[PDB]
Symmetry: C2
Subunit: 263 residues, 2 copies
Amino acid sequence: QYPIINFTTAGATVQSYTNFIRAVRGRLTTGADVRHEIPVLPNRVGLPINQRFILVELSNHAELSVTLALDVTNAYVVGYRAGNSAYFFHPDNQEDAEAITHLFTDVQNRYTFAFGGNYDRLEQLAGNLRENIELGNGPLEEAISALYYYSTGGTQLPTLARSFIICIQMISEAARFQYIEGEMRTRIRYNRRSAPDPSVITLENSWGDLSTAIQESNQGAFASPIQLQRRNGSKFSVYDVSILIPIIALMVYRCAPPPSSQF
Amino acid sequence: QYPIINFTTAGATVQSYTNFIRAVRGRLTTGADVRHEIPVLPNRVGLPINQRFILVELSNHAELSVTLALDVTNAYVVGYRAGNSAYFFHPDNQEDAEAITHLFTDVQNRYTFAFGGNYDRLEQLAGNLRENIELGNGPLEEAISALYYYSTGGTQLPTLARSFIICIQMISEAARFQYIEGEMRTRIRYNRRSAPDPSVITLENSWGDLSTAIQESNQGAFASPIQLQRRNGSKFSVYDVSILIPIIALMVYRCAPPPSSQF
């Protein structure tokens, strides 16, 4: 009964991927809460368990499916189901451990990993940094197969971690950032697989801080600039929400919006 | 041959005044130059004399007309014609003194005042501050008559200065600020005459600094906040262009726009 959105790599096009990311955004946030034109995900505080997650069912040309569970409070992958097994990243706290008991409740085999789904950890297990892991439709198709076969011994842990890294950036980070969505659409459009450049990496790294800075800004103006990088690795300073309007699609809830206080 | 826009106080309504201010804005600025969604008047540097001014012909229920000349670089009144006499505020420099020779060129009687048309001066000559001078359709109708009769000895200097103060705020400041336009539309709508409150006064006082601050901002964010007042006189700090989008309609050109430099 949590909302499901389907996507397939089989015959994927810029348009089918765009439709899919737009649907994911529409199930992640209502639109109750927009700050500077940028939507905010639901506040976890007081959020009912029936509204906590959404499910992304991914299929591939190999005719395999897996279902990722995303937390609506941060857009992040918390676990997945393949067939009669489900696996959850190690929960941050007791409330998160209880919440995940409400996902994939008829699966006969439920496992919680000892490790978290954060990039520092997954890259360590993968033996590769995000900057050395190709993204694109071929990587995603392959990642789906890897997650699918984990339960029967076909996927080694590094491969599994690599495959998480792929799914999280092509789904969760693309939902968070129109800019990352745009980078994935380009890879699909021109059949390219390629590792994310520093523009993608720094946006991923900065998403929580950008969320805070926008929400705590004085009328849009950041108290402290955030340094990002361009595609060539050069510095780009962000001083204001205005420059992020085309870039960021959704933010983690960080504070109550201050009163309208228009002139 | 400079563009003329007509307005009458006779039977004025919110709609006829709105039409009139929209027309004045459309002849003041092209739209070549918009910074944060807020239009900029033409740069005076290199501006051809044939594009320098516009003319506002004001008529009243008494069947009197005067024509104000506005400089397009700052929206300000530089002089007026009534019948066979024209009067110009004291020019700031030699380029401005030459420019005004191109206005009302067939008038038989041309005079330049020794005093400028700035508020500090006009209030001194009027013997009243803006905060003690009623604005509204009755004040404007009266101001038109006062300017009209100046040449024949019917208008004393304080009355003349008061009448300038009226015209400049109801025309030039309303063209500059949708907020001041809105305050004048309210006075027309409810037949009220009343002196401008601190929200109006501080916006007038700050127009040049707001223009600079927006144009020199870092992506919208002011280096230094500008303090305005609300209608009750309380402080309102402005940190960012975003809060001024509904308030300010046009700005004096202060600098070249920096490169787009989008992410």
